[PDB]
Amino acid sequence: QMLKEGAKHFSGLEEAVYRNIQACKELAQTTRTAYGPNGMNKMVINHLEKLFVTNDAATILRELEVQHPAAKMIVMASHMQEQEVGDGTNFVLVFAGALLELAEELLRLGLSVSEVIEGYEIACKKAHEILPDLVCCSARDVDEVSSLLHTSVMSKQYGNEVFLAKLIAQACVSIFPDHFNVDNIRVCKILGSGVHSSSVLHGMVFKKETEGDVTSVKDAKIAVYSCPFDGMDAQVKAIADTGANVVVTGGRVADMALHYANKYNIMLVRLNSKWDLRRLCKTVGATALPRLNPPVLEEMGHCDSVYLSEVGDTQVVVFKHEKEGAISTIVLRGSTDNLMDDIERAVDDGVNTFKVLTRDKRLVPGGGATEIELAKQITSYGETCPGLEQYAIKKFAEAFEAIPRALAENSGVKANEVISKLYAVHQEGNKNVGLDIEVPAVKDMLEAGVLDTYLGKYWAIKLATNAAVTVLRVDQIIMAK
Amino acid sequence: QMLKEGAKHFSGLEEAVYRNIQACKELAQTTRTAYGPNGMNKMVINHLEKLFVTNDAATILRELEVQHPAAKMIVMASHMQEQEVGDGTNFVLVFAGALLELAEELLRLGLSVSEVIEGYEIACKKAHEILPDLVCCSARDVDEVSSLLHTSVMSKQYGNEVFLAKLIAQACVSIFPDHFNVDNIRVCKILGSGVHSSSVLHGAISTIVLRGSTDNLMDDIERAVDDGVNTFKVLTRDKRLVPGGGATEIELAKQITSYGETCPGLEQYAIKKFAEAFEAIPRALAENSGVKANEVISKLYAVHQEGNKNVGLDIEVPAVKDMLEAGVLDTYLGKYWAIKLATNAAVTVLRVDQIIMAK
Amino acid sequence: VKTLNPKAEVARAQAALAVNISAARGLQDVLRTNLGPKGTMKMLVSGAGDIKLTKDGNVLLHEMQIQHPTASLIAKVATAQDDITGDGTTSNVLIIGELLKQADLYISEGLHPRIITEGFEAAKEKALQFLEQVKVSKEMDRETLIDVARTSLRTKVHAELADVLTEAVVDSILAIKKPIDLFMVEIMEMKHKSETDTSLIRGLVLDARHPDMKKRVEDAYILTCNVSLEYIEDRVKKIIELKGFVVINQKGIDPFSLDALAKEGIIALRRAKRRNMERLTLACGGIALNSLDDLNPDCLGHAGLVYEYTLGEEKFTFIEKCNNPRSVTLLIKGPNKHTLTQIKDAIRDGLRAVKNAIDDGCVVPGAGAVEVAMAEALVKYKPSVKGRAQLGVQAFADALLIIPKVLAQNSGFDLQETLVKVQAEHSESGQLVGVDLNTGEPMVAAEAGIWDNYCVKKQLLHSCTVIATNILLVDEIMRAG
Amino acid sequence: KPSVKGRAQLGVQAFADALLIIPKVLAQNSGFDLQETLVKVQAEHSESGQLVGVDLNTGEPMVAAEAGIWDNYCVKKQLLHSCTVIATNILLVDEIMRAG
Amino acid sequence: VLVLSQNTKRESGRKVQSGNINAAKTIADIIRTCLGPKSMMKMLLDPMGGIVMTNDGNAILREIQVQHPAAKSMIEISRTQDEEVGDGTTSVIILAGEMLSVAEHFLEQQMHPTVVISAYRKALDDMISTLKKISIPVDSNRDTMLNIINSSITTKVISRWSSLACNIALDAVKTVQFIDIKKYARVEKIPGGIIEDSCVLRGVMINVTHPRMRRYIKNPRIVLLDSSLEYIQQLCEDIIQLKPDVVITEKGISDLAQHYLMRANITAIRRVRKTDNNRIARACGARIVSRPEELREEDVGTGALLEIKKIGDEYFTFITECKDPKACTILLRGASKEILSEVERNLQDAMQVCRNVLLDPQLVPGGGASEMAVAHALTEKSKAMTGVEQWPYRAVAQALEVIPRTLIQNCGASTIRLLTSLRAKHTQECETWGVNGETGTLVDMKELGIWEPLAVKLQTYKTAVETAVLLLRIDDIVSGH
Amino acid sequence: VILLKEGTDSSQGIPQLVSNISACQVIAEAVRTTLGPRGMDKLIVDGRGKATISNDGATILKLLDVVHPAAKT
């Protein structure tokens, strides 16, 4: 009879390897174009006829309809990498594929899959030892801060304002970074004017609902509410006794509760997301007051500035100037929703990168430089490690050659030529030597500015490696239909 | 890759053994209807538009294109049995088919082809030992002559004048036989008039002017005319003539079956089976007479073990009867060799499994 | 003939045996890909898109929609091998499969099944009796236990931290043996951090609901309560009077009841799994009363140190130092949840491995070391039985050699070649000769620590022979009614 | 085979098993059990000596030298030679290439 | 146009006979390989999920959904064979099918069934006469009487507890023997415990309406009552005036009637199955009466021990020690309902064979010894009959040889060879020689201790033959759409 | 097995640019005639009848049934 039931697609040994590897390659190359300032975005439209124009690989994979087992593993690699530091989302993808590609070629020759993993796993630990030694430690310091932020802003659609997005993110992550947290950063996408209008507000912005209320309150006594203001006098009256000139309700507010809050000169705001309430409690010091009867004067947070700005022609309350504002708000501005989307996508990344600094100062000269170095080192390492592993180790490194290869790829520069040249000049110019796309030729990344985070690379190698290895072991899997 | 040549039909073991037996058996059944006094003629026409309505197996087989190798063996048996004595030319065939038939059954049970061969041969040698102890001796004497000649003219087309034809071969083979030899007999087919107008031309070389309404009738009469002559040659060369009517067969089947009981082993089956073949003779005899073989044989066998050898089967009257008292006595030598040739024929055929035909 | 109902498949003559043999053989090869330290786990995805990724054979054969009536039987064999013993579940499937292969070889030759059965059966008994002569006698020795438990952890994921987990297993098993009981070792898995933080608590580990309830009770008297504490203060008054400082409730606690409990300094938890309640009464010696008014100062369990420490941002309630040091908890700290899934299975087997090691001083050289032995033995045992039986024994011995072959298989080395070396070295060194893949040559399994429990091998031959042969009898199933 | 050792051990053993085809076939052409006879013949052989053979005419293992059954030397010798030699060659021929 | 219905099949002459036979001969070649200590259990699969893997032809034919009536009758053959002497259910099926295979051989030679049947029938008597003519009388005697019940219970799921089951049937059949009626052995099975808790109760058993009433009576004078005691005082006074002490009510008794009978010291049992009222009137001698107004001191039976015991928390009434304990009650204990219906049958079949050792303890050596002698005898009778029927006689006799043939077959040795040697020594040294499946050689059964009760083989020949009749008679089978 | 289901038409490399290029070129041509003082008006019908005579590309590209990505751009 049938070894397995019906509707169960199976694959054993190489048969599976080819499929898994192949699927991963096309998926790794698809996003490969989204690397460097030559990153060619893509337009994915789900069932709901929604158009998504993003350059971030993770955003792409998490929006693409993937049903292939091994292929899904790539979506995980990009997911974790995006959750770790954000930058290098595509790095892991492509690399992961190259590995499998070099490995598969080893099997077809007669090499045991076992040795493959061992060789690759052993080289994964060697690299994690080379990177920390070669890395270029940088100096906090607004001077060094802008340097890394300036190298994380490029390669995107907002490259025209890489100087503005640099200072904007440099100010925010430098007002409350105790141990910095990317969650204390609220970005807002307001349409109107070019991105060269983006501002940095020291606080949290939102949208009020009452007019007759105080549009611009001085030292406000914020009172975060969550319970609806529907019935309305005793509820709004108990808020005027505490001295709350600013009401931030979580749910809806009754029209009679608004007119009363409008008569008490108390600026009321209804329909406030649950996260905006929490962010307002850790910025001004307000207490999440459930009911409208227990609020007092010790539950009111202080906000020196709570005015109503109509930037871009849309009303927005700016709760800035507080005692210990632990959460700032990035006021983005865009001429189109498209540009506004891309910009924000990159802003977050920089937020994570900065978060990497607060927990890792080290940085490496990106642009393929580090890759080539590791390839060089690892290769030599393989020659120092006898056994069939010498082949696997060298093959692993040969994979890193896919990163700069993609670089000259999305630029139309013959990889065969640029690579050979890169290595040569790299074996003499050391680490710093990289590839400058803007000008097809070798160049010192450290001087060009292009510097990536050490930790950013670290995880990448590990995550990608371990992941790829897994997909290679499971060489036999039917299903259970 | 291609085994032998292109279009070379071959077989081995079961498939083969079955192919050969099927052909032989069928070839035996066809002529099996030409045995006994109920022998029904056949109409065979060759590539020359020639019609030969003969009842003699030999004549038939030698008119039928038998390319089938395994079957060819059956053509030799009838030919050889027609050269020696003639009469019972169908007796050697039918028997042959049976032997192989009850043989295939044995193998398909799990027996060894060899053990089957050994048995049949052991019993065959034994049978020929019972033949002389049962044969009815005799001595030239116009008496026993016209008696054997009469039982040799029957079972043939011209059986209507079994009396005249009897006297025809009675005079001739009694004028120059000095050590008789059929090479002195010259049969002439003269179309015209019935068969009652037959004459005997005198003399070491007598001419036999035969008369026949048509050709088919002419050949039929002549065919057997030689039967009465040949049989005479045998008797004058062998003073022994066993009782027919199936009598001898049954007894040989009664002795062999018990002979297998005294000789155990894989031979036992083969032996008892060998004897079961002799029962095919009285079976065919009844066959042509439209009588139930199963019933007639069982009855015959019972009385046979009561009335002894003599007990036979009288077709002219569906019931067992004494052949020796009914005047039914065939040639000893005739039966003798038949059992030999047939037993031998079947054997070689069996020992042959691989054959590279072509179609 | 119409003895069957429309649509009733019927196996007849050799046809049945053929389909059956190939069947059991196929599934036997598919599972043969995950045997050894170089094995490869399989990812089975049922209908709901579920994704079961494990290495254990049993589980796999329990998720794969098998349509092969024979394979289905092979699934029942791996089951009786995991319920009675556990580890090696795979080994069995291969034996029975390979076994049928040797038989068929004979059947197609003309040999009748019956005579063959007697052949194998004759070898089985002798085989089981040989395992009684080759069993290594040790004791509750902590050293050998560490070796076995360690070797068990190997060939899997945790093979990275076998040394640590193994140690914890030996201790937990040493404190739960009376006659070892695994139900006394609570396996609690938690995410966050690495799997190198796993510790061994000697009490209970629940995964103060109110912010005013003590976060650490000394001689905490547990007042187990099953009923709900909702529709209140009168129920809290009855607890304080019964001297219950730690009320672990199985149902939710009314918000108002928590305020009255925390006001008294009472540490009460809510929504506790029924399985955790029964473990709290058998460790601290407490009585779980249904209604809140059935509790009394004599139903309070005696605890030594009940503290609530964070096991990864999640505060867990540790109720260790119980009056009965026979109830230990094996906390599992590791990366993702999926990882802990496999690991938890590793310990389940580690505890069982050590369990049988102490309950049975048997410890034979695994890694095929035993296989080859028995094989050669039978080879010299067949000439003493002769008859077609000689073949049976031989075949059974040749079928036993599958284990070492598969070893050289999953490793990559030449199956046949290695077999010759191991066999030639086994008949020169003794029963301590095994197939060490890490060295690519036959070594002393008893010197590398590679040891297996007698129960395994013993039980193996048992479940194999019986079933296997039975599959040679069933020459027709016919689905009718 | 246990002396030469290595993958050859199998080769030799297989060659020995292949030689056992003669006795098997004999019982095959006689009507006796193939395997059954092989056992009896092998057992007695490993007892009496090179004089034990398969006597079909009796259906049991008998002494060839006794029954008078003997084969010339040249015959046997030439048998294994022409066999193994040519036999192996065919095994090496992994290709032939043809046309139509 | 359409004679018999539309769309209907129609056979005739050489088509009716041929089909009828083959159908039965075929269904025989399905379980034939399941005969002997080397049988081959089949694994049927009904369209529900119940995989029945048995060796007993009966249970096999009761699962195989049949269509053709011819085969259905065969199921009736096994339904009548397993209902008598149990085992041998296959033997009869094999023979019945063979007798036909040889019969058709005559149907081709053209021998009307009549002439055939007549022989088969007269031959059937031949075997019987021979059986009792060569069978040995084995002594009741509890000693041998046990070895007769045992040999049957053997090789069964009950075999484990055969000894106990044997005595159960021993005591049961040894009590209902006055001509031993098996319709007095009331079997009762209750879940709980093992098969070793079974026992034999001397009296009817019911499955104390007042907690104060008599729990046990010294001289119980039961009064079978069908009507109800509900609407009571007058009804309860007409019973007490009959000098009773236990009223077995078939329907429910009113609370009032419960106090009145309790007031007079009379154990009342309301709601008693009708079947129980019939068993109490035959063991205790209490006449069953409708209304109470018809209850006299004559319908009152008499017991000697009516104690209510809790057979598993279920207080079952035990009315044992009846004057005429001709109807005992066997309490069968089993893990489940499967080991309960199984054990029940093995016990029942055991009761039958034992029912023979006390009426006609005749038995013939197994190993087919019986079949052979008869076959050899019938062959003699053939020559003593002559005529056309002389052959048929032999045919049947040669058809009884299938038992030993198929016997040695499932062993491996030659079937024909053994047959020759069988009849040989069997025609010399009496019938004491039979086939030995363990030695593959004909051995003196009588001397080996292999004997089977005549009855066992008695029913065999009778059934098999009779079967061929009703089938051979089947002239036509129309009736279609 | 199988990355994308039977429907996720994957166009990468060049077979993507081409298609998007051809359609864009053709759509433009449609209005390419409404250029100039003597342009070629287009009576756009909304299937339901209502015929709209326009000469402006916008009004035309906003009243036409566009179902192509590169076209909607």
Swiss-Prot record, chain B:
Q: Name one GO cellular component term.
A: cilium
InterPro entries per the UniProt record, alphabetical: Chap_CCT_theta, Chaperone_TCP-1, Chaperonin_TCP-1_CS, Cpn60/GroEL/TCP-1, GroEL-like_apical_dom_sf, GROEL-like_equatorial_sf, TCP-1-like_intermed_sf
- Location in or out of the cell: Cytoplasm; Cytoplasm, Cytoskeleton, Microtubule organizing center, Centrosome; Cytoplasm, Cytoskeleton, Cilium basal body
* Superkingdom field: Eukaryota
What Pfam families does its record include? Cpn60_TCP1 (PF00118)
Annotated ADP binding lies at: Y35, G36, G88, T89, N90, F91, M154, S155, K156, G245, D330
- Please name the top-level EC class of this enzyme: hydrolase
Its catalytic activity? ATP + H2O = ADP + phosphate + H(+)
A single Gene Ontology biological process assigned to it is: protein folding
Q: Which residues of the sequence carry a binding annotation for Mg(2+)?
A: D87
Q: Which residues participate in ATP binding?
A: G88, T89, N90, S155, K156, G245, D330, K335
Entry's Gene Ontology molecular function annotations: ATP binding; ATP hydrolysis activity; ATP-dependent protein folding chaperone; unfolded protein binding
Question: Where is this chain primarily localised?
Answer: cytoplasm
Q: What does this protein do?
A: Component of the chaperonin-containing T-complex (TRiC), a molecular chaperone complex that assists the folding of actin, tubulin and other proteins upon ATP hydrolysis. The TRiC complex mediates the folding of WRAP53/TCAB1, thereby regulating telomere maintenance. As part of the TRiC complex may play a role in the assembly of BBSome, a complex involved in ciliogenesis regulating transports vesicles to the cilia.
Protein name, entry field:
T-complex protein 1 subunit theta
Q: Which gene encodes it?
A: CCT8
Curated annotation (Swiss-Prot), chain D:
Subcellular location, record wording: Cytoplasm
Tree of life domain: Eukaryota
Residue positions binding ADP: D71
Q: Which residues bind ATP?
A: D71, K76
Role according to the record: Component of the chaperonin-containing T-complex (TRiC), a molecular chaperone complex that assists the folding of actin, tubulin and other proteins upon ATP hydrolysis. The TRiC complex mediates the folding of WRAP53/TCAB1, thereby regulating telomere maintenance.
What's the subunit arrangement here? Component of the chaperonin-containing T-complex (TRiC), a hexadecamer composed of two identical back-to-back stacked rings enclosing a protein folding chamber. Each ring is made up of eight different subunits: TCP1/CCT1, CCT2, CCT3, CCT4, CCT5, CCT6A/CCT6, CCT7, CCT8. Interacts with PACRG.
Record-stated family: Belongs to the TCP-1 chaperonin family.
Mind telling me what this protein is named? T-complex protein 1 subunit zeta
Species: Bos taurus (Bovine)
Q: Give the shown range, full length included.
A: 426 to 525 of 531
UniProtKB/Swiss-Prot annotation, chain E:
Keyword Zinc: yes or no?
Answer: no
Residues given in the record as ATP binding sites: G36, G88, T89, T90, G367, G437, E452
For the cross-link Glycyl lysine isopeptide (Lys-Gly) (interchain with G-Cter in SUMO2), the position is: K9, K337
Q: Where in the cell is it found?
A: Cytoplasm
Name one process (GO BP) from the record: protein stabilization
- Indicate where the modification Phosphotyrosine is found in the sequence: Y231
Chief site of localization: cytoplasm
Which residues of this UniProt protein bind Mg(2+)?
D87
Q: Which controlled-vocabulary keywords does the entry list?
A: Acetylation, ATP-binding, Chaperone, Cytoplasm, Disulfide bond, Hydrolase, Isopeptide bond, Magnesium, Metal-binding, Nucleotide-binding, Phosphoprotein, Ubl conjugation
In the record, Phosphoserine modifications are located at: S5, S163, S227, S228
- InterPro entries associated with the record: Chap_CCT_gamma, Chaperone_TCP-1, Chaperonin_TCP-1_CS, Cpn60/GroEL/TCP-1, GroEL-like_apical_dom_sf, GROEL-like_equatorial_sf, TCP-1-like_intermed_sf, TCP-1_chaperonin
The residues listed in the UniProt record as binding ADP, with positions renumbered to this chain, are G36, G88, T89, T90, S91, T155, K156, G367, G437, E438, E452, K457
Has UniProt tagged this entry with the keyword Cytoplasm? yes
Q: What is its EC number?
A: 3.6.1.-
Q: Which domain of life is it from?
A: Eukaryota
The record, for Pfam families, names:
Cpn60_TCP1
Query: Which molecular-function annotations from GO does this UniProt entry contain?
Result: ATP binding; ATP hydrolysis activity; ATP-dependent protein folding chaperone; unfolded protein binding
Recorded hits in NCBIfam families, A to Z, give: chap_CCT_gamma (TIGR02344), thermosome_alpha (NF041082), thermosome_beta (NF041083)
Record family assignment: Belongs to the TCP-1 chaperonin family.
Tell me the subunit arrangement. Component of the chaperonin-containing T-complex (TRiC), a hexadecamer composed of two identical back-to-back stacked rings enclosing a protein folding chamber. Each ring is made up of eight different subunits: TCP1/CCT1, CCT2, CCT3, CCT4, CCT5, CCT6A/CCT6, CCT7, CCT8. Interacts with PACRG. Interacts with DNAAF4. Interacts with DLEC1.
Q: Could you identify this protein by its name?
A: T-complex protein 1 subunit gamma
UniProtKB/Swiss-Prot annotation, chain F:
Where can this protein be found?
Cytoplasm
Annotated positions binding ADP: G36
**Which residues are annotated with the PTM N6-acetyllysine?**
K62
Could you name the domain of life of the organism this protein comes from?
Answer: Eukaryota
Binding positions (ATP): G36
Please state which protein family the record places this protein in: Belongs to the TCP-1 chaperonin family.
Protein role: Component of the chaperonin-containing T-complex (TRiC), a molecular chaperone complex that assists the folding of actin, tubulin and other proteins upon ATP hydrolysis. The TRiC complex mediates the folding of WRAP53/TCAB1, thereby regulating telomere maintenance.
Q: How does it assemble?
A: Component of the chaperonin-containing T-complex (TRiC), a hexadecamer composed of two identical back-to-back stacked rings enclosing a protein folding chamber. Each ring is made up of eight different subunits: TCP1/CCT1, CCT2, CCT3, CCT4, CCT5, CCT6A/CCT6, CCT7, CCT8. Interacts with PACRG. Interacts with DLEC1.
Q: What is this protein called?
A: T-complex protein 1 subunit eta
